[PDB]
């Protein structure tokens, strides 16, 4: 439990300091893929 907490603490500190992102060029395609799939299925969004 000490090793699992320390490895998660170093990984979360590396995510803020360094940039292991979600490949921002392809991440716009993933947001466009879900926008196209929801429009093709014509599903209404979840209401308030």
């Amino acid at each position: 439990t000490r090793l699992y907490l320390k490895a998660e603490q170093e990984r979360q500190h590396n995510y803020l300091k360094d940039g292991p992102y979600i490949t921002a060029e392809e991440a716009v395609a993933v947001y466009t893929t879900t926008v196209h799939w929801l429009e093709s299925r014509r599903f209404s969004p979840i209401p308030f």
Partner: protein, 41 residues
């Protein structure tokens, strides 16, 4: 991409609303102007 998809889904709905207005106008004209026994009976 959020500002681009908001305008893209709006233009896609406007063409769909143009398709919805065209499909409703064609169905109303075929149901009213009947080929046989429209309003004589």
């Amino acid at each position: 991409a959020d500002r681009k998809a908001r305008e893209a889904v709006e233009m896609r709905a406007q063409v769909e609303r143009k398709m919805a207005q065209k499909e409703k106008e064609k169905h109303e004209e075929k149901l009213r102007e009947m080929a046989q026994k429209a309003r004589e009976r």
